[PDB]
């Protein structure tokens, strides 16, 4: 994993460059929006359990997925499904602080589309539960912070489809 | 199932089923005609067990159906009674399997993290299981009720 | 007018603790600062808030001190997502149809008809 700072040091290190004006622009962009990210990271961490409760109610609590025979029917399959939304919200917050989507490829998306196919989990339903979790979060944290969190939700959705 | 649970106990120790384990599986299959009659006594009394068991629950826990509770509303109380039907169905599965394995893998594993996510009081679901046990055990004799009473007893303790 | 410093707050808060609220507002209303400005026939006001040629002011006092502050803000503050069991919605995707849904063209077959 690398954040927005480590991402710029690593790209200049493999070229042998001192930090020029173009690398200093990317470093200034993160330092300016850095106060906006520590504010959303503390408001998402305090409403973590109730964000997923409202995001499931908006997407797939009132479909027939919980009907007998589908996924998330039994208690084990219902509890394991909110644990993933529990995963996606916590790793999209690590990516919004770091300013880099690098941690999602390493610790989330690695072999995940094959894991859902082996288990049978509907991937299009997981994407709409994540799109609801994007709407619930973007109203809690605001428009600027909510538009950054929605940048790393789309990254999980694109790497999952 | 008593058969499956006895095989995983032997396979874990890398051995054959002992004569004491085999002797238990013998009287399990021979008593199958009687155990199938206990499960059918509950299967033909769902309307009385789930209606009475749910009416008794809402009198000991009136706040779950009062305005502001989890099971408030026509559709919400129906889901409330829908869950007592889920747990009465699993108790008939366990009477036939001879073990609490059908109840455990369907509706007991991950049940506390599940209800806490929906905001449902876990102690209000255990109260509705104890009230179904009162109706169900009154339909059976001295023996054949201690058998049915255990599967209701385990679901209470395992749910808390 | 505004508090001079946070020792004026300490000096006057012991009137409320030993005489109650009724003796604190008798002592405040009988200061010469009150009787020279408002007397007994004028409603009080924020004195000298804005300089005569300036465009901005000095943050009027109902906005500078609301009902409660940073203390009490960790017990009197409300919440979002309160675990409160509200009214349900039951079919959320039927209110916001997706792109290829012919329910977006449903109040158009009323127009282009036999007429």
């Amino acid at each position: 994993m690398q954040d927005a700072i480590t991402s710029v040091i690593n790209a200049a290190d493999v070229q042998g460059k001192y930090l020029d004006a173009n690398s200093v622009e990317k470093l200034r962009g993160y330092f300016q929006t850095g106060e906006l990210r520590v504010r959303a990271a503390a408001t998402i961490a305090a409403n973590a359990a109730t964000i997923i409760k409202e995001a499931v109610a908006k997407s797939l609590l009132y479909s027939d997925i919980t009907r007998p025979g589908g996924n998330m029917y039994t208690t084990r399959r219902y509890a394991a499904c909110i644990r993933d939304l529990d995963y996606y919200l916590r790793y999209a917050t690590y990516g919004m602080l770091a300013g880099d989507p690098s941690i999602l490829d390493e610790r989330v998306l690695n072999g995940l589309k094959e894991t859902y196919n082996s288990l049978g989990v509907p991937i299009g339903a997981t994407i709409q539960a994540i799109q609801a979790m994007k709407e619930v979060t973007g109203s809690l944290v605001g428009s600027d912070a909510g538009k950054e969190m929605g940048l790393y939700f789309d990254y999980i959705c694109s790497g999952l489809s | 199932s008593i058969v499956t649970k006895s095989i995983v106990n032997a396979d874990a120790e890398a051995r054959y089923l002992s004569p004491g384990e085999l002797d238990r599986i013998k009287s399990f299959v021979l008593s199958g005609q009687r155990r199938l009659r206990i499960a059918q006594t509950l299967t033909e009394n769902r309307e009385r067990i789930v209606k009475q068991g749910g009416q008794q629950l809402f009198q000991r826990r009136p706040d779950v159906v009062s305005p502001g509770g989890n099971a408030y509303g026509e559709e919400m109380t129906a889901t409330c009674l829908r869950d007592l039907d889920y747990y009465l169905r699993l108790v008939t599965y366990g009477i036939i399997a001879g073990d609490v394995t059908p109840i455990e893998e369907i509706g007991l594993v991950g049940v506390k993290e599940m209800y806490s996510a929906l905001g449902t009081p876990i102690s209000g679901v255990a109260e509705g299981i104890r009230c179904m046990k009162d109706v169900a055990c009154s339909l059976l004799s001295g023996e054949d009720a201690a058998e049915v009473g255990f599967y209701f007893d385990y679901t209470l303790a395992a749910m808390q | 007018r505004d508090i001079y410093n946070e020792r004026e707050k300490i000096a006057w808060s012991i009137i409320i603790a030993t005489q109650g609220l009724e003796g604190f507002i008798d002592t405040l209303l009988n200061t010469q600062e009150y009787l020279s400005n408002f007397g007994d026939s004028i409603v009080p006001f924020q004195r000298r808030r804005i300089i005569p040629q300036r465009s901005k002011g000095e943050m009027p006092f109902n906005l500078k001190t609301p009902r409660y502050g940073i203390e009490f803000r960790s017990k009197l503050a409300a919440t979002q997502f309160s675990w409160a069991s509200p009214i349900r919605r039951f079919r959320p995707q039927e209110q916001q149809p997706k792109a290829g849904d012919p329910a977006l063209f449903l109040n158009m077959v009323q127009e282009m008809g036999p007429g």
């Binding site: 479909s63 027939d64 997925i65 009907r67 025979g69 589908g70 996924n71 029917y73 039994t74 084990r76 399959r77 288990l119 049978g120 509907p122 299009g124 339903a125 709409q128 | 599965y93 394995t101 059908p102 893998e105 369907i106 | 079919r91 995707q93 039927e94």
Partner: peptide, 22 residues
């Protein structure tokens, strides 16, 4: 495998196809 087990064949829900009018 176990008691409550998922399979594509015994899945009659609209979970793999998002027909949201059902």
């Amino acid at each position: 495998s176990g008691y409550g087990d998922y399979s594509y064949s015994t899945d009659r829900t609209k979970g793999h196809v998002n027909q949201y009018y059902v």
